[PDB]
Design a binder for this molecule. Structure first.
Ligand SMILES: Nc1ncnc2c1ncn2[C@@H]1O[C@H](COP(=O)(O)OP(=O)(O)O)[C@@H](O)[C@H]1O
Ligand SMILES: Nc1ncnc2c1ncn2[C@@H]1O[C@H](COP(=O)(O)OP(=O)(O)O)[C@@H](O)[C@H]1O
Ligand SMILES: Nc1ncnc2c1ncn2[C@@H]1O[C@H](COP(=O)(O)OP(=O)(O)O)[C@@H](O)[C@H]1O
Ligand SMILES: [Mg+2]
Ligand SMILES: [Mg+2]
Ligand SMILES: [Mg+2]
Lengths: 172, 370, 370, 172, 370
């Protein structure tokens, strides 16, 4: 569909939030991650202009800057069965993502977003646009099984060791 | 309505979100009978919780399920929570979301087991675990400030600038009440009073809350105590005996500013607050030098705010304006913040529900709560 | 009325054509929170623009969407432009033709994208992209002269004679205020001062603007600083700490004349200006020598004009009259010229219109604009 | 003399020993306290080098970190009248101390050394150097008779306690 | 023969030039007793240095004279040098030229005072202060390469090509082993292991060295730790208590590649190296990409070289050949290079001599040393 499309490598690394901010109680994981992928999908200027204009329409439609547009697209894809054009556009963009030269780093960022920001907490009910992007980065779909977490309690190897300070105000 | 904050080492603070104060405090204590039982009618229950464990302290072995902010006895803690719901609040926990508290840098198992007990043994519809210093800042009306919370087991600093915490700047000392109390009974020995374990520890705690204060200048206060009688004050024991206490009543909380009194190597609470600042961004420190918020019972000593004001004015550039915020309701700021937080409509999505719990298990608490 | 927006690397200068000064001058920065949480209602705003980002600096990571006069982050540049139109000028862009600026010898995609956004995102009726040195010459009133424009991202000089530009004589150095800011925080480490964050870079920029100056003779100034303390100046950081800097005050601006300070092979701005003049026809050189006009913030160092006067006089033949023109409004000369240009009745036909854009697309900019 | 002499704020706090150590059997209060003052008098690198070199030499002579030199200076100060230059130099150093930006904290530390470590145990017969340093921090000189130690024997409130201090002896 | 003392934030590596290894490697610590003694004849020493301080740490307060590569306690550094010369090497320093080392971009006063102490306090005939990364490249035997040097206090990159340093491309990052030790102390509180206080920093440093490693794929390692429990390893404290550490084994070193988790804004060591190479001339980058030299204890994590290879590969263009050189003796490479350099015949004229010192003063070090 898009031949001669090139990307500036590492252009998206500046866009990745700090891990501590990912833990913010009002962090918008979906919008921030889609912003990272949008930055990564920015065509390099060396891409021929007809292709640049062509693809920029595709990613602008699927990954708009505006929140109103992003929320509008989020609703329309909730009943994607009645939007064959979006199906085709999203399929075209998923194919672009899976061939992105830095897909491996993008997958790591997607995994960090799921690990840290709860990006995929909806698991299988992740909306259509986000799921296709994650499918493009993670081909097998194993991300739908949310991240594995530590579960500290009842661990086999943890017992109440007393340190130098804990021993000052011990109890029994 | 929702039940709100407490995990206090020394005191429970229970109540309803939206109220201005906890409806029931009572100490965080479970006492077991000792050396009794002959008479048929002199107590049938094997344990007593909170109030009326203090009353029976003479015949009971009192022990706190929470030590230095960490709950170490989950059997007694479930008793205290059961007492809190059924005997103090007179509510059924299965129909009220419950908000709990935690000191920062606690063991993560502590939170996981807290959320497990709430959902499994009390079947609460939803719950939440908040950070006590964050709740103190909520209560103070601020979105900016470094809050020095100090209860019965933990004193910790949390710097927050615009609702954003700087977690790398969190400081925590396991030096609070229950170390001042234990130091005080050590220091009363040289005057002549022993106060052996448990019930007499509670007695000593009571005299600390009444007679102890922080000297603005410790050396000058010591000299005054040495050359005068004006600092001597007397306290009446439950059995009628009267003890006289002099400089011991400002040397006890002096441990906060000189932890080497009790063998600790850490810096004093003044230095630790200053060190928490200076780990924050240079552009945040001025706002943090002001908005130095006090919280917790251990900040209730007379003259502690003015001594912290003095100590932090030192260690800091003279152009910085050090301001200590010590509201009179310091002791309940944490609960007051929880009541405010649990009442906000915007917070109603932040609750962890039974549904999320049974989909994810205990560890859900980490990816839902600060 | 037409909007003029001098979209420099460091600052946005925006306003209405015909005014003597820009209405909105704010940093060209987008800041995003880099810390955590932690209070309900206090984090819904991701990203801050301009002055608000600079005030919340301490909890944000700051990023310039323009580097070396080139837009590198088009999503953030849209935010900067949306802030300029709707929040700083309080205008509907679809009602106002917009004149904007760029450095010469920029990538051509830079103009095409900024034309795309103005017509397709802001729905501007018409727009134009002018060269900043040409606008500065407009502001100077002259029609002849070699402008040295040095802002935050790039320093360029454009020789013009009787209104004719000699494009083969345009010079560019990617050495401007931001490089000088970076060098200063590098040499500030010599005195034990460590500035590493983007916020600290902003404060180091503030130090540069307040304390740095160009030494008329660099070696004598070094000898003076080495032999005495007369050149030391103190500066108070936002947290009350006071730093003092001696020869760093003039070693930082010296990079303009000795780019090898930061490892660059390029010649200094004095030699670049002389090389630009010598690339011009032998007949126009005399006028260019007498009409060296400075513009941009990076030409606001004390002693910069005197140093340039001296340096160029040493390169030119002794019979030429070197004159540096450094208006006190240097920092806004570019915006002033654009305000003049957009209000001239003879310019109203040079606008790129929405209709021409529709017919031709973004490439219309290369045909209609220098 | 030392124009522009500046000091690093709080540089001396790590030099203050534990109060428990101040009670040690073989604690050397004088050297430990003069070490704290020496660290407190370390000029800030902000200070111009010619001033820094000049004061650095002064404190090297009067507050040497070498134990052999410190004792030699102490013996040399037994006859301070026979060393006019030493008397004047300590006068110069004493003037610097009284103008220290953190004189209040240094004196508070000096008082702690007195009460806990017996720094001023010799009272008026204190060494010339140590006394002149203490005078710099405490101008009135009250330290020569200020260490008011509390006394417990024969003071009001002393009485026996039983029952609710255990030790139940109801047979008396 | 000359002495080579690699001071280091964490360890002193001292020995004679021409040897293949330093004679003395001991902690760069001075310990002071905290407690009361209390016997006659015990504790007449006021301080302990090096291994003696480490042995007696139970009753000492340990302090590092050097922090972030900058000597912060000159009195305690003088003790460490006296200990090195007299107790560890057993040499009269008046007889041996001494080669010292420091990190780049250190405060200038740091090396001036080093010179003053060596010439005045210890009376060395001559001395030299070298850059640690340059010494590391000497030890490797290469003349080209970008050294990544990471000890206890400082991580710095120095790119060198054909023996020429590109100082403008030098990167320094105040995030090193001691920062990782502090972070390991912080995350060990998530389990019950609350060192939380200054007594046991030395022992959690030992846990760090023994058990921590760099995960090649952080998400994969996190999932493995969450699921299997095959990453768990146990450590026995001096008390005999056993702690079990799981994902903290690779989370602590992950801070090197994600300076977040400690509130730092800087890029990870991989991206800093790449940024350093990209600040170099395009024509030497290929040889830098193939000569990434790692030195220092903080590069001794299992898997760090492989992680660096993967990370720099993901940043560089695919046609470049990324090669990480991690000698087994890279912990002493800095000292090895100093031994090589000090024993070269051509170096004998580079020594700063006592005559040159007292003729010029401490500022001589800036002329004769990089
Ligand atoms: N006026 C007072 N003076 C001294 N100590 C007090 C005072 N009021 C309360 N305290 C102490 O503060 C502690 C209670 O503080 P609190 O914030 O409730 O801690 P927690 O949250 O652990 O229950 C108790 O140990 C109590 O002895
Ligand atoms: N008074 C001053 N002295 C020295 N440098 C200055 C001064 N004012 C501004 N600058 C520098 O000029 C730059 C901004 O100049 P400006 O013309 O606004 O550039 P731009 O057009 O790219 O925004 C900043 O990087 C700043 O460091
Ligand atoms: N095998 C190892 N694994 C991980 N870290 C190590 C290892 N050996 C040493 N370190 C770390 O390296 C640091 C010391 O490195 P070193 O090169 O001596 O630094 P310096 O030159 O500052 O003394 C210590 O902080 C230590 O924790
Ligand atoms: Mg509390
Ligand atoms: Mg400009
Ligand atoms: Mg090293």
């Amino acid at each position: 569909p898009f031949s001669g499309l090139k990307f500036k490598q590492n252009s998206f690394l500046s866009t990745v939030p700090s891990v501590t901010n990912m833990h913010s109680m009002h962090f918008d994981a979906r919008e921030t991650f889609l912003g990272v992928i949008r930055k990564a999908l920015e065509p390099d200027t060396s891409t021929p202009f007809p292709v640049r204009r062509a693809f920029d329409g595709l990613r602008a439609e699927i990954l708009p800057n505006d929140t109103i547009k992003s929320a509008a697209l989020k609703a329309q894809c909730s009943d994607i069965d009645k939007h064959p054009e979006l199906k085709a556009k999203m399929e075209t963009l998923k194919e672009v993502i899976t061939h992105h030269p830095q897909k491996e780093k993008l997958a790591e960022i997607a995994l960090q977003f799921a690990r840290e920001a709860g990006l995929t907490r909806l698991k299988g009910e992740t909306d259509y646009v986000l799921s296709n992007v994650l499918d493009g980065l993670i081909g097998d779909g194993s991300w739908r099984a949310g991240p594995a977490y530590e579960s500290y309690l009842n661990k086999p190897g943890v017992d109440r060791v007393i340190t130098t300070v804990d021993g000052l105000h011990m109890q029994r | 309505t929702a039940l709100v904050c407490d995990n206090g080492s020394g005191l429970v603070k229970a109540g309803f979100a939206g109220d201005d104060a906890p409806r029931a405090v009572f100490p965080s204590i479970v006492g077991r009978p000792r050396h009794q039982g002959v008479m048929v009618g002199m107590g049938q229950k094997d344990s007593y919780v909170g109030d009326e464990a203090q009353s029976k302290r003479g015949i009971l072995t009192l022990k706190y399920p929470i030590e230095h902010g960490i709950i170490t006895n989950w059997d007694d803690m479930e008793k205290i929570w059961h007492h809190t719901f059924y005997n103090e609040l007179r509510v059924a926990p299965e129909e009220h979301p419950t908000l709990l508290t935690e000191a920062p840098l606690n063991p993560k198992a502590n939170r996981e087991k807290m959320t497990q007990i709430m959902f499994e043994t009390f079947n609460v519809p939803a719950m939440y675990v908040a950070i006590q210093a964050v709740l103190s800042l909520y209560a103070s009306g601020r979105t900016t400030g470094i809050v020095l919370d100090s209860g019965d087991g933990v004193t910790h600093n949390v710097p927050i600038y615009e609702g954003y915490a700087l977690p790398h700047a969190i400081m925590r000392l396991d030096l609070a009440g229950r170390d001042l109390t234990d130091y005080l009974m050590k220091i009363l020995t040289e005057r002549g009073y022993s106060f052996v374990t448990t019930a007499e520890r509670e007695i000593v705690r009571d005299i600390k809350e009444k007679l102890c204060y922080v000297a603005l200048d410790f050396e000058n206060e010591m000299a005054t105590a040495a050359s005068s009688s004006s600092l001597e004050k007397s306290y009446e024991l439950p059995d009628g005996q009267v003890i006289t206490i002099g400089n011991e009543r400002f040397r006890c909380p002096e441990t906060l500013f000189q932890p080497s009194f009790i063998g600790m190597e850490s810096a004093g609470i003044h230095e630790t607050t200053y060190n928490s600042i200076m780990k924050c961004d240079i552009d945040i420190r001025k706002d943090l030098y002001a908005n130095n918020v006090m919280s917790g019972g251990t900040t209730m000593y007379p003259g502690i705010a003015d001594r912290m004001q003095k100590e932090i004015t030192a260690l800091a550039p003279s152009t910085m304006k050090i301001k200590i915020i010590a509201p009179p309701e310091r002791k309940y700021s944490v609960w007051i913040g929880g009541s405010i937080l649990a009442s906000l409509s915007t917070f109603q999505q932040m609750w962890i529900t039974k549904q999320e719990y049974d989909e994810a298990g205990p560890s859900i608490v980490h990816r839902k709560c600060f």
